[PDB]
Design a binder for these strands. Sequence first.
DNA 1: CCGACATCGCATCAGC
DNA 2: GCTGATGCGA
DNA 3: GTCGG
Length: 326
Amino acid sequence: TLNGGITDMLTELANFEKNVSQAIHKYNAYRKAASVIAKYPHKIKSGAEAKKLPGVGTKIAEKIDEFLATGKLRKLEKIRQDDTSSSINFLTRVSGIGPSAARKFVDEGIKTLEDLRKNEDKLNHHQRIGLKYFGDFEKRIPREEMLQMQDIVLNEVKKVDSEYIATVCGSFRRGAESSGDMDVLLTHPSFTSESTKQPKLLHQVVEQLQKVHFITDTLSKGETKFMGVCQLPSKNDEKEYPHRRIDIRLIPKDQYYCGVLYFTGSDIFNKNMRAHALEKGFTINEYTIRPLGVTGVAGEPLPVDSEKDIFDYIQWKYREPKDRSE
DNA sequence: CCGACATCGCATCAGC
DNA sequence: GCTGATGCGA
DNA sequence: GTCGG
Ligand SMILES: Nc1nc2c(ncn2[C@H]2C[C@H](O)[C@@H](COP(=O)(O)NP(=O)(O)OP(=O)(O)O)O2)c(=O)[nH]1
Ligand SMILES: [Mg+2]
Ligand SMILES: [Mg+2]
Ligand code: NA
Ligand code: NA
């Protein structure tokens, strides 16, 4: 945490621009800046030194100079005192309440947790579950709990069909000592890029997990992506575990390596890698890496036999999951 | 200077 | 109902 | 907000 003060500031500015200003590119700018500073192996002494890093320009160098000199940012201090910004920033912390809805709720006089709790009928389903578990979703998950959760998910999936493979990705796969949620990549040989020979592949799994009272709530659910809530079982006389966010993503079996690269992240690592791909003349998603033709239209999927193959195409040296925490 | 900034699944709405 | 845009989270 | 062309 060499430059924690600076990266915290930039993250709060990023959050401001996303939630309040609804300026997603500023949000991404601040996030890129914070990320590149987070991995810089020196205690930054000035905005000039920081400006050397890619993603840090003039405006952010100035803010860093102000922050180093005073320990504060006046811009952020005023934002913190703004009632409307404070209200919007708070509401967006509920899952399902984004910048537009947050501002709309404020317009209608709904701006506190207590307000939300007495206006449950003005929330959509996602938002109501997000409110329900507002407290729990703030808490992080120790890796030890992540390991118990893994063991339940993998074993219940096996019981449905032994040909399923479930892989825990996200921050867990990057070796994090704690995670914000659980991310599960799912494959089955019946679902490939060429065909789907069995329906309800994801549904079966979701249902098995509900059956054993592991999955407790659903935020959204389609053919390939589940987003919901789960909970570890507790023992006699002990306080229950917090409820946790869990996502399950079914990916075509033959596109596992693009899928696991994507779901391992980080989110900023993925954006940076896909950015780099574009400069090298490719586009990468969770399914494929494709060349960009003379037009700027994606060509046919390239052969991929490992995560490293994807790195190879764009002339990046391979990075292990633990080194992708950007 | 200025266009372009990764990419996509699900829920919801607007228009037909 | 279909299509396409928007919001949201990932 | 930043930066390559
Ligand atoms: N390409 C791309 N991938 C993303 C993005 N957001 C998430 N992913 C991919 C890569 C992410 O790693 C993965 C899961 O997203 P989380 O659970 O939101 N983040 P994580 O598990 O890393 O951290 P933690 O849960 O401890 O907070 O989905 C995105 O904006 N873009
Ligand atoms: Mg996660
Ligand atoms: Mg997640
Ligand atoms: Na820079
Ligand atoms: Na939210």
